[PDB]
Design a protein around this ligand. Structure first.
Ligand SMILES: [Ca+2]
Length: 561
């Protein structure tokens, strides 16, 4: 059977065929030859390739549901010798097209660049592991092994199955392996560098949820912090956290942040490049509304041009981060940034507020962290033992969350839950020497206006890494994105090709001194286009003093003033 052919492809199915899978419980459902597909308005052309899909470790969980680790692999006929895995998102449970997303709002897929590409659902399936008594598609959390699969094991099993298929199909191993993930996918990339250092040579970890079990602790905190500013009750009698601030209120706050913080980088441009000086300077309880030259905080009754003392107290407490009775921090604080709002044409940015507040225009709580996926995930996936409950109870549970008792549950084991959610899901280790010392390179990125995971918390991980590993910028660099929301969106340069510079760093030792980025919504600044350099932490973009402020070539990376 010739290598890299339709016959080699279809032979991967038989199971009586020659093919030897590292995991004996690997079942191939599909091995099909796929014709080249043209470019579309939204996707780069795909080459001719072999598509393999199936499942590892089919079983029944202790909840009585089916579990397996699905994968989908695409091996181009004409291969550049590179292997590529994409990361997940949310609580996973779906199996993408597996053409290899590189994020950063890119048109090009890794498969369109002649990589072999793989993806997984992470060990459960949203169509089948949907349990109306354990909050829907988070129900995989009732099964101890489904937790370990979600945390680390699925990515490991699928990486090995993929490299074995590559070696059989092409008759050689990949020259280099690359992983790109954002959010849950960025947690996965950091987990790979820590737990499986030789799985990937290059890793991009965007907005990484490396402490994801603490997300719901932040959520209980932001929920209780904002409840005083809430107006009205939902059907269960929970305050409408979504009514704490209107879109106009959040735009006023972002304008005040720009009034204090915009020019701290040397240029007034609707972007806070000097995020550190901003956190030192801005306090909404003393700052000016620069529209009217008066205090942001209302002196009399609430108007459109001010925030009430209760709103200011609420947002300051939410942003400060959760503490227990002892005043011990349980997560981290969040950065004040312009991307908490923004206006493009007639449209207010929803990309910050959807996490802690939800939609203003609603009679129900719909924030991720109040009643949505993130609050549900905490209760069933990260709390040990799990706390399944009707969906109508979730917001009340966040309101009565106890910061001395509930936070212990991400460190506990219980009955058949023999690892804590910090053990299986967390990726807090700074022991990266095995990764670095085999030639591994890691690009981290994070939007400053991310309300899922704190940019400042990624920066603190990076600080702890630099302290544990002198010269860390030789193998790992962090790119903070002023104005960007969770993975994409918001008034910043949220679009970039991370794969090109990753390949250059891994294969040529060329470290990214900067990464070109451009705004997906340049409407936020009223321009056609804005391109800026992303800078390796702790550097920021500095205007050179002349030229179009919308052109990258007029900016350099430097220490803050
Ligand atoms: Ca600026």
């Amino acid at each position: 059977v010739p290598l890299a052919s339709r016959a080699a492809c279809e032979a991967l199915k038989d199971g009586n065929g020659d093919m030897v899978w590292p995991n004996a419980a690997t079942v191939v459902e599909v091995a099909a030859w796929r014709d080249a597909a043209p470019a579309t308005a939204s996707a780069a052309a795909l080459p001719e390739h072999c598509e393999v899909s199936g499942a590892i470790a089919k079983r029944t969980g202790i909840d009585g549901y089916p579990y397996e680790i699905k994968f989908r692999l695409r091996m181009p006929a004409e291969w550049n010798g590179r292997f590529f895995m994409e990361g997940g998102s949310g609580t996973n449970g779906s199996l993408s097209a597996a053409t290899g997303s590189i994020g950063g709002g890119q048109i090009a897929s890794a498969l369109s660049r002649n990589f072999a590409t793989i993806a997984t659902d992470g060990g459960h399936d949203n169509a089948v592991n949907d349990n109306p008594d354990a909050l829907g598609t988070v129900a995989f959390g009732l099964d101890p092994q489904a937790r370990l699969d979600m945390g680390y094991n699925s990515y490991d099993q699928v990486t090995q199955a993929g490299k074995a298929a590559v070696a059989r199909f092409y008759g050689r191993a990949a020259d280099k392996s690359y992983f790109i993930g954002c959010s849950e996918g960025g947690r996965e990339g950091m987990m790979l560098s820590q737990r499986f250092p030789s799985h990937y040579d290059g890793i991009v970890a965007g907005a990484p949820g490396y402490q994801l079990p603490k997300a719901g602790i932040s959520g209980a905190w932001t929920t209780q912090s904002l409840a005083p500013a809430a107006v009205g009750l939902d059907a269960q009698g929970v305050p409408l956290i979504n009514k704490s601030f209107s879109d106009a209120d959040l735009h006023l706050l972002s304008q005040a942040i720009l009034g204090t913080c915009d020019a701290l980088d040397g240029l007034a441009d609707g972007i806070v490049d000097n995020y550190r000086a901003c956190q030192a300077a801005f306090d909404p309880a003393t700052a000016a509304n620069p529209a009217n030259g008066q205090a942001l905080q209302c002196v009399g009754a609430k108007t459109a041009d001010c925030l009430s003392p209760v709103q200011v107290t609420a947002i300051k407490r939410a942003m400060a981060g959760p503490v227990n009775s002892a005043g011990t921090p349980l997560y981290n604080r969040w950065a004040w940034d312009a991307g908490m709002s923004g206006l493009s044409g007639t449209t207010y940015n929803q990309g910050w507020r959807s996490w802690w507040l939800g939609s203003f225009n609603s009679s129900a709580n719909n924030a991720q962290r109040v009643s949505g996926f993130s609050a549900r995930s905490w209760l069933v996936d990260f709390a040990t033992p799990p706390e399944p409950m009707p969906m109508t109870q979730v917001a009340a549970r966040m309101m009565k969350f106890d910061f001395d008792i509930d936070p212990l549950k991400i460190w506990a084991t219980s009955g058949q839950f023999t690892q804590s959610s910090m053990d299986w899901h967390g990726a807090t280790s700074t022991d990266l020497a095995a990764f670095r010392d085999r030639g591994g390179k890691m690009i981290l990125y994070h939007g400053m206006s991310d309300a899922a995971f704190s940019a400042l918390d990624t920066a603190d991980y990076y600080e702890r890494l630099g302290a544990a590993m002198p010269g860390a910028a030789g193998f790992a660099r962090l790119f903070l994105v002023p104005g960007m929301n969770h993975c994409s969106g918001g008034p910043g340069t949220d679009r970039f090709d991370m794969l090109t510079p990753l390949v250059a760093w891994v294969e040529r030792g060329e470290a990214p001194d900067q990464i070109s980025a451009w705004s997906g919504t340049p409407g936020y600044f009223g321009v056609a286009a804005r391109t800026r350099p992303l800078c390796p932490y702790p550097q920021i973009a500095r205007y050179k003093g002349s030229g179009d402020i919308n052109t990258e070539a007029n900016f350099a990376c430097a220490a803050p003033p």
